[PDB]
């Protein structure tokens, strides 16, 4: 147990500096030492990697490593991301050394000779490194070919295939932080939100909110994070399509009332003009009639637990603004009419 700490941290440091362009002093000696250590780790993951205090101890060490670094400023180094990546740490290191242009020639040669001896060692008991790298190239080409010859961007994002992989990555990253319990998920989500492209992130969130559990703590954390942060939810309900938010809300009743408040507020900031028979907003970024009609139509074409809720939230806002029965006076009258 303690024997493995100085091994693992040392390997993580060597790996992290591997990707860095200081590689001048490296030699066949360094690379051999690297790969023998990596063999030891790959063996460990195999031997006693499941169901013990050792697995959880290593996870603790890894996640503490990944949070003391965090991934801000001095280096956004991946590192081996999780306990499963121990089983292929040696491949990562190798890939990084092939990317380091600053690698010396004799080092590179010894390296490539140790990855690719040839078919002289076609018979091997352990799935060796050359097979692993060939099998990696295969998968990569397979992924490219499906994307450009078969794949189609599904409209029902939940059922698409890129988004559903991102989602499950995010969900794994929430579960790991929950078990870690060092810093709260809200912090992780906030940091994510600043770094990377927001509209993409939001699409992803929508779909992650719907994936069934893989042990619903994942979704349960995100609902709380979102209800805490209004601005994102302002851009959330603004960016996605209708049916997705409809399925979201039927799934999570905690999201229903606020979302209706958001829609109700966009209704109340329209004005009718008599010359063109259309509700319009004054400002340009105020949702147009068509989008607001869309969302309400999606919400009303839903399971009954939500249909009565949205319908009642609309009638109460109609009666609130004078109980007219004729168009040109109340956005809420025009909605209730454009439903029958």
């Amino acid at each position: 147990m303690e024997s493995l700490l100085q091994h693992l941290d040392r390997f993580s440091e060597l790996l992290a500096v591997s990707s860095t362009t200081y590689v001048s002093t490296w030699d066949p000696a360094t690379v051999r030492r690297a790969l023998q250590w990596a063999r030891y780790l790959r063996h460990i993951h195999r031997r006693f990697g499941r169901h013990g205090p050792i697995r959880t101890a290593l996870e603790r060490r890894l996640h503490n490593q990944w949070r003391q670094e965090g991934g801000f400023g001095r280096g956004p180094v991946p590192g081996l991301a999780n306990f499963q990546a121990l089983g292929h740490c040696d491949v990562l290191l190798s890939l990084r050394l092939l990317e380091n242009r600053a690698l010396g020639d004799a080092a590179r040669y010894h390296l490539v000779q140790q990855l690719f001896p040839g078919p002289g060692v076609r018979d091997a008991d352990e799935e060796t490194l050359q097979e692993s790298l060939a099998r990696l190239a295969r998968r990569r080409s397979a992924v490219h070919m499906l994307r450009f010859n078969g794949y189609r961007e599904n409209p029902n994002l939940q059922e698409d295939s890129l988004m559903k992989t991102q989602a499950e990555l995010l969900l794994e990253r929430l579960q790991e932080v929950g078990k870690a319990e060092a810093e709260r998920p809200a912090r992780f989500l906030s940091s994510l939100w600043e770094r990377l492209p927001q509209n993409n992130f939001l699409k992803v969130i929508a779909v992650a909110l719907l994936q069934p559990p893989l042990s619903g703590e994942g979704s349960q954390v995100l609902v709380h994070w979102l209800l805490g942060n209004s601005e994102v939810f302002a851009a959330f309900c603004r960016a996605l399509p209708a049916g997705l938010l409809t399925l979201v809300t039927s799934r999570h009743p905690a999201l229903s009332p606020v979302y209706l408040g958001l829609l109700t507020d966009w209704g109340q900031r329209l004005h009718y003009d008599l010359q063109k028979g259309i509700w319009v907003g004054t400002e340009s970024q105020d949702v147009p009639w068509e989008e607001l009609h869309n969302r309400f139509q999606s919400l009303c074409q839903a399971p009954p637990p939500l249909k009565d809720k949205v319908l009642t939230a609309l009638e109460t806002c109609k009666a609130q603004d004078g109980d007219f029965e004729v168009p040109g006076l109340s956005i809420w009258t025009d909605l209730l009419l454009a439903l029958r």
Partner: protein
């Protein structure tokens, strides 16, 4: 030490001008063309590997002219870099061209270029942008999501196909048939990638309602080949539907059985039985359409040879496997036997289906004596409402082992006063389409021979020349086989078997034939559970030594 350059220096120019035509297969025609030629390309690269391995880099300039352009063109085409071992060899070729200690700038530029192209193979972000951006934030390297993404990509596609099948004649959303053909072309280079197998099985089961074939025959052949070498392991429903939608693929599969019984595993019926049961043909042949075409290729082989014993045994094995699978998996509403064997009287088949495991060893004589009677009726009394002829009733009778081989051994068990109807059956076996004058002459010769053999058996252990006297034609193989059955049967054997075998094994064809015979016999015995350990050990030793002469 003959060519060393010439055929290869031609192939080089052929492939290089072809890679130049191809590269990256972003169209339909480059794709179909790559998927065809790729297999040879692989071999070409193995030979090229051998060539560059034995020699060294940066010193020699033989084909160093354009090796670079060749390996690049190869690498950016992904239908090449995803086939069975192409990528691994392409790595090797670039590892040979590297140099440890560069001197001239050309060697350094080469090594850099090699790192570049290797990195393109392994580690380039030619994927969608936003998905790349998302991962770096979460701290994921390509390797530790590539697998799930593929997996999750495949399942998606499989569902869509599944849904297109159920929407047959439905107002929605028709999966554009262009994309189905596209997927079918993309699965072909990477069929030995385990991660895609889910997609294949869905493509083959989800035939669709389109009357034209939407998949292209480069796809059926690849799957078919790969089922037979056991490199894909699909489930049975998929292979049965592949057979049923692409008959030239069932021909190429049933030929791959004939090479198994002609070349590799001649007269080892255990390895044939193992192969047939493991292959799916018996399970697939419960479908009458496939049994009429599999049976038609057996007939073509039965006619090309004029009744080769090796073909007969294979047919017997096949039919025994087929029977307990027709039986096994059709409880209510199965097809009627005049639908698999449509020429003969169904009566006859209904008799010959009854396994001899079920019958006591003593009642085999009665059953044979009855079958003989009904066969004689069906051939000689060739009236309307019967077989097409003698050959057809023969070709039936051949399908059922057990019955056809026990005949001689029952004549020997009843060697005192042989029944003429059994003599008829036996003579009929070794030659139909003879006419009564021939069949009678053969039968009376055989009866005289049986007279000689009973006398010789009840005598002591005698020579082999006394046997060559009565052996001394068109009726030789019958007498030969009867005499072999006599050797194995009589306890006078195991002493003088060699003396007859050496003399009978004139050529290699008679030897192979006798080997086949003995294998068939031991298979038959071990199956029926009928055994005298003298004959078992005797035949095993003889077979052992005769397998040496070949």
């Amino acid at each position: 030490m003959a060519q060393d350059s010439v055929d290869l220096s031609c192939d080089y120019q052929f492939w290089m001008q072809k890679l130049s035509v191809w590269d990256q297969a972003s169209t339909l025609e480059t794709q179909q063309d790559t998927c065809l030629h790729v297999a040879q390309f692989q071999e070409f690269l193995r030979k090229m590997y051998e060539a560059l391995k034995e020699m060294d880099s940066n010193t020699v300039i033989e084909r160093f002219p354009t090796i670079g352009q060749l390996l690049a063109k190869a690498c950016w085409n992904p239908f090449i870099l995803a086939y069975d071992e192409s990528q691994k060899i392409l790595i090797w070729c670039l590892c040979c061209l590297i140099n440890k200690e560069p001197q001239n700038s050309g060697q350094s530029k080469l090594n850099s270029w090699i790192q570049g192209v290797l990195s393109h193979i392994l580690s380039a972000l030619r994927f969608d942008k936003e998905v790349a951006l998302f991962t770096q934030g979460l701290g994921y390297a390509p390797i530790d999501y590539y697998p799930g993404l593929l997996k999750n990509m495949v399942l998606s596609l499989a569902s869509e196909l599944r849904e297109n099948h159920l929407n047959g004649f439905n107002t929605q959303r028709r999966m554009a048939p262009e994309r189905v053909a596209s997927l079918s072309r993309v699965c072909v280079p990477l069929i030995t990638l385990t991660d895609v197998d889910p997609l294949v099985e869905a493509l083959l089961i989800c035939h669709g309602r389109e009357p034209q074939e939407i998949l292209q025959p480069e796809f059926f052949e690849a799957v078919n080949e790969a089922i037979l070498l056991k490199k894909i392991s699909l489930p049975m429903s998929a292979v049965v539907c592949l057979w049923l939608r692409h008959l030239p693929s069932l021909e190429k599969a049933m030929l791959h059985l004939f090479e198994k019984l002609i070349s590799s595993e001649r007269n080892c019926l255990r390895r044939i039985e193992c192969f047939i049961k493991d292959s799916s043909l018996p399970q697939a042949a419960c479908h009458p359409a496939i049994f009429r075409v599999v049976d038609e290729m057996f007939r073509c082989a039965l006619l090309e040879t004029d009744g080769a014993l090796e073909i007969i045994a294979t047919i017997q094995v096949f039919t025994q496997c087929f029977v307990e699978a027709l039986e096994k998996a059709s409880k209510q509403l199965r097809f009627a036997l005049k639908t698999y064997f449509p020429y003969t009287s169904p009566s006859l088949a209904m008799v010959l289906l009854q396994d001899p495991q079920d019958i006591p060893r003593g009642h085999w004589l009665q059953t044979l004596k009855h079958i003989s009677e009904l066969l004689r009726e069906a051939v000689e009394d060739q009236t309307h409402g019967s077989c097409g002829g003698p050959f057809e009733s023969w070709f039936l009778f051949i399908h059922f082992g057990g019955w056809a081989e026990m005949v001689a051994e029952q004549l020997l068990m009843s060697a005192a006063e042989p029944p003429t109807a059994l003599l008829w059956l036996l003579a009929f076996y070794y030659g139909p389409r003879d006419g009564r004058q021939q069949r009678a002459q053969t039968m009376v010769q055989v009866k005289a021979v049986l007279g000689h053999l009973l006398a010789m058996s009840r005598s002591s252990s005698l020579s082999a020349q006394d046997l060559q006297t009565v052996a001394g034609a068109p009726a030789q193989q019958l007498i030969r086989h009867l005499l072999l059955n006599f050797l194995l049967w009589a306890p006078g054997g195991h002493t003088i078997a060699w003396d007859v075998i050496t003399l009978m094994a004139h050529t290699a064809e008679i030897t192979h034939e006798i080997i086949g015979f003995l294998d068939q016999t031991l298979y038959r015995w071990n199956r029926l559970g009928i055994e005298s350990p003298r004959s078992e050990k005797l035949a095993r030793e003889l077979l052992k030594e005769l397998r040496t002469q070949v």
